[PDB]
Design a protein around this ligand. Structure first.
Ligand SMILES: Cc1cc2nc3c(=O)[nH]c(=O)nc-3n(C[C@H](O)[C@H](O)[C@H](O)COP(=O)(O)OP(=O)(O)OC[C@H]3O[C@@H](n4cnc5c(N)ncnc54)[C@H](O)[C@@H]3O)c2cc1C
Ligand SMILES: Cc1cc2nc3c(=O)[nH]c(=O)nc-3n(C[C@H](O)[C@H](O)[C@H](O)COP(=O)(O)OP(=O)(O)OC[C@H]3O[C@@H](n4cnc5c(N)ncnc54)[C@H](O)[C@@H]3O)c2cc1C
Lengths: 609, 608
């Protein structure tokens, strides 16, 4: 078997027993897709992920890509290219792509449940396959002429990149200095150096790459508002037929040596510096780059959060299988009897504590991203939540920093428990967990650091939104708390305390921000507390959704579930209760810490660190 | 310079301004070592560590050792062996060795401060260099004739190993099946396969290796009580002269591919399986193996804990230096002004929070291992704490699982913050933090997993000790709490944290007492034991940081200026930050421990 251990059963439970995404299946935009077909698609990609995609997971890390300075190209290991061909040959790079581009219409919740498997098995494979989806974004923002090129790009399976970051412009995107110079023929010459560009070359996987490049037109003003977005293809091509023509002046100059995710080629990218111009076309023929890059942003944040949970999930299931088989020590009830039978380590309290921590966070994160995705289709949000399109969009916007920020921080931290369950063997490359950890560290950095996520969440998704999306979610949690089984009373009580705790954090932080008008330095306490607040909201949402799942599991058990279903439902009840009693209470101390924040660390001389 | 960034200034602060190790230097066992020589030694090893030792840190990981299965030997990268020779040429493998073995007598607190630099710069270099310290343990436990061999091994710089683990006996040491077959002439033939043995081969670093092997004499009883310890040399040698002779039957048969610490050869070791007996000599000529291996275990635990803090410390200082230089974004007070000047990232609250978290925990851990080491010499414990040898031994015993268990978990977790400070660059091998992380993940596994540490802490170091060492430490925290207005809030927060930990200890003890009536109650001890150990660590960190701030306030009040002034101000800030931001969480942890239940123990395994 491969390293990759999937959990289709938990995805189906979320999609169909908890959130009810099957209500929209078979009607209107999803007329061509029934629930049975959705279930079969999930089983099928899970098998693909466990087979040919996971097949090259180890090889891509042990035999990583090599930059060739003689040609300014990257060479990828042959086994990974075999995996990519399996993904393309099955049409999986076109799941959730618009029908007019050749895609299969489906709810975003189903789409991300399918992508979870590729991210768990070999996450760089999904990254290299994000071309069609970026072509769709270019389609939606382009002129009528540009839509014709985007159609070509989608149908020919070109690769794509998102090209923002520069040596001195990473978190501060508005500081970019890459330049765009308008030409007499209405094209632009793009000039500058970009850094950390994922998939900037990809060997012979594709016949072209579409680079979407942020750059500052000559004479444009400063900051984010002065940035425009350009379509910059690796090769010139015939704008009617798609025939590949002459090389365009956009070249990789290095491939980074990274801790993990090694088979994803992460490149320094030079535009206009190797003898020929980097010709670009202004997207939509309008100057609106950051706003056009928005749906790319949102996609990248969902991808990172799904990746984090995908990897935690397979890390947990690998640890669990190991623990079931490993014999070590006597039962703690027999510590004093040195004739006692040896037991499998799932009999040890600390190991069960570790495994339940891993399980609860893995399942809680899965529920979070699928919950989030039910707000990404107007149809689904109306059907499953009764929410209209504007509020659904604002709730999605609120949740994405949680999916990304909380997910990225939690998965890496809980994989520590996964490795620990194997004992010394977890430190070995023979088992996949050490690579999961290395591959997962990037999650807190890619598409904006955790602190940027947490600042965006508070300043933009709460304060600027005047709290409307947050109020909606809080009201859903309160409705669950106030609904009247007795087997979930203590969970509901712990959730009520956690809800009050997060509300108190929000109010303290909001006070610090509003007081900044009188005392400017007050705002620093918002920065000091932002990440802890984001993580507290993640824990609340986790606990609430686990409890919701436990409520469905109780109904299903009372209705007579048996066998492997019964075991699944009992595990949901156990994980919800464990999380409520062991993770949620810590938010009370965090609330008090945030209520007691001060400016001393800001006033300290830098020379004192 | 190199990746390794040292902090001698903090070590000297602890040693001489907080704990008063100065008081024993220049008298009795330490007659010919004064405080000025100790400071020079710290500066010297730190410079060696930053230079020749750290020089091969990257090479060891990127060009890791290669095993030849037909010769049963490993080849180490040349630059790493050059680092080892720099260590041997300066006599640093004999730090704290007994004078009669060629060492320089010193307090253990100074010894581990010296060693911290090697562990920060290239931790596998110290690990390969642990021979002489293991020779002294063999000397102390040996017959008169074995003491002669230990003297040879120490003086010649032989390597050494501790050989316990087998494929089916890791946490459960007592399950070991390796056997010892007594020969007519009183030697033994050892037969079995051990796994995960550090330094079981080491290329040509040493003339010989002393393997100290746990094995079960034929016919002995089960469990740890049936195990004996054997001196098993790689090469036979002339017992009078030390001249190395013919190969003994102990051969490496595999070298593991690990996440980190790659240059430390971690080996499958086969005894008696290749047609050649693995001859062993019963240590002390008595059957008492687990007790003999104990002094080895305590050294290992101190080592792991000191390695954890050494690595976090250099990880923090690398992050700090990066943050001082990296310009990104506007000041938060100028968020709306698109013309605002860009600032260095140390201006951002989240970076300052991150850096203070890294600083407070690195410095708290350093104080913990130095504090612990002040109980490892009777005369230091007498002069600095006023405690006798018996109590001192029991306090050292209590603290070592904290050094090991709390340190190992803390350093790896807080290095996540060090990497984050660099942003995307932190994910690059061009900077040393990702290797710090990979190298540190072993700390929670080497010499016993965290769960084993925490179970040892509670059952053996508290319950079996009847709480005597724990009550001593608690009484010292309480005397600090009860003793000027500027540390009032810190003292209040420490008093809460002390009560929280005392409440957790009472809850777990109660669960153990209830197991007299309902055996399953014991499982609650297991469920909570690691959280309890981590809570005691946070409490000790907070207390020791606050004691450091008290001294820092005295030195500022007296008129400190310049870099000293900045150093002391940081000590005050770290102690305050830690009390307000780390300690209050123990209150929720106490409540969680009070509410533990057996639901997770009763769940069907199939339901996970
Ligand atoms: C890099 C490295 C170097 C090493 N060097 C040496 C060396 O030089 N010499 C040497 O002798 N050994 C050495 N070891 C062995 C190391 O001490 C063992 O890995 C460790 O003791 C755990 O044993 P194990 O790997 O068999 O894990 P296991 O004991 O199988 O543990 C698996 C899991 O079960 C849990 N578990 C097991 N028993 C219990 C219990 N009773 N209660 C609760 N939880 C339990 C563990 O905490 C862990 O999470 C080394 C290991 C490593 C990783
Ligand atoms: C593997 C990898 C692949 C990537 N792929 C791409 C890609 O395809 N396309 C692309 O455009 N980019 C890509 N990036 C860049 C990515 O989006 C990040 O934004 C970038 O790495 C973060 O900026 P930086 O590395 O310059 O760090 P910095 O911005 O220098 O941040 C360093 C530290 O300062 C903190 N900080 C900075 N500003 C603030 C602030 N205002 N408030 C608080 N703290 C702050 C950060 O949180 C961090 O702790 C990639 C990065 C990596 C690691």
């Amino acid at each position: 078997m491969s390293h990759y251990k999937s959990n289709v059963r938990d995805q189906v439970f979320n999609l169909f027993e908890v959130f009810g995404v099957d209500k929209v299946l078979g009607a209107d935009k999803f007329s061509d897709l029934d629930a049975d077909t959705a279930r079969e698609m999930l089983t099928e990609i899970a098998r693909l992920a466990e087979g040919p995609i996971a097949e090259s997971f180890v090889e891509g890390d042990r035999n990583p890509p090599v930059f060739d300075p003689e040609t300014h190209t990257v060479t990828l290991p042959e086994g990974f290219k075999k995996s990519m061909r399996a993904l393309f040959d099955g049409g999986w790079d076109k799941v959730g792509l618009a029908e007019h581009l050749g895609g299969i219409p489906m709810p975003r919740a189903l789409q991300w449940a399918l992508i979870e498997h590729i991210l768990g098995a070999n996450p760089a494979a999904y990254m290299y396959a994000m071309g069609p989806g970026m072509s769709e974004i270019f389609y939606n923002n382009g002129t009528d002429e540009q839509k014709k090129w985007a159609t070509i790009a989608a149908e020919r399976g070109w690769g794509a990149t998102m090209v923002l970051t520069e040596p001195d412009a990473g978190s501060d995107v508005g500081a970019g200095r890459t330049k765009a110079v308008q030409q007499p023929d209405g094209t632009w010459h793009i000039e500058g150096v970009k850094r950390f560009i994922t998939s900037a070359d990809s060997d012979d996987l594709f016949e072209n790459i579409m680079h979407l490049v942020l750059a500052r037109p000559e004479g444009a003003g400063p900051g984010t508002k002065g940035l425009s977005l350009f379509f910059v293809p690796k090769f010139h091509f015939d704008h009617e037929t798609g025939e590949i023509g002459e090389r365009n002046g956009v070249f990789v100059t290095n491939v980074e040596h990274k801790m993990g995710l090694k088979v994803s080629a992460t490149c320094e990218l030079s535009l206009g510096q190797h003898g020929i111009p980097a010709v670009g076309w202004l997207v939509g023929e309008v100057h609106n780059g950051i706003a056009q890059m928005f749906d790319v942003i949102e996609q990248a944040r969902m991808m990172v959060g799904t990746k984090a949970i995908a990897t935690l999930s397979t890390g947990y299931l690998n640890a669990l299988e190991y623990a079931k088989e490993r014999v070590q020590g006597a039962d703690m009830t027999q510590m004093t009897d040195k004739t006692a039978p040896r037991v499998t380590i799932t009999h040890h309290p600390d190991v069960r504590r570790s495994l339940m921590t891993q399980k609860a966070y893995a399942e809680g994160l899965r529920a979070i991203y699928l919950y989030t995705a039910t707000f990404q289709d107007a149809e689904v949000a109306q059907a499953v939540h009764g929410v209209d399109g504007d509020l659904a969009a604002r709730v999605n916007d609120l949740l994405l920093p949680i999916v990304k920020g909380f997910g990225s921080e939690t998965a890496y931290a809980k994989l520590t428990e996964s490795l620990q369950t194997l004992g010394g063997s977890g430190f070995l490359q023979d088992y996949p967990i050490e690579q999961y950890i290395r591959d997962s560290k990037i999650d807190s950095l890619y598409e904006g650091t955790t602190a940027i996520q947490a600042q965006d969440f508070f300043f933009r998704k709460i304060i600027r939104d005047k709290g409307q999306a947050l109020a909606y979610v809080a009201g859903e949690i309160e409705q669950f708390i106030k609904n009247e089984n007795g087997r979930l009373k203590t969970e509901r009580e712990l959730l009520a305390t956690a809800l009050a705790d997060v509300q108190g954090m929000a109010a303290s932080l909001t006070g610090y921000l509003m007081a900044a008008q009188e005392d400017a330095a007050s705002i620093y306490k918002v920065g000091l507390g932002s990440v802890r607040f984001l993580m507290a909201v993640g824990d609340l949402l986790s606990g609430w959704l686990l409890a919701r799942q436990a409520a469905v599991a109780i109904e299903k058990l009372d209705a007579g579930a048996t066998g492997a279903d019964k075991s699944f439902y009992e595990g949901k009840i156990a994980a919800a209760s464990f999380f409520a009693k062991n993770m949620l209470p810590l938010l009370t101390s965090t609330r008090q810490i945030i209520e007691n924040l001060d400016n001393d660390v800001m006033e300290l001389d830098e020379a004192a660190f």
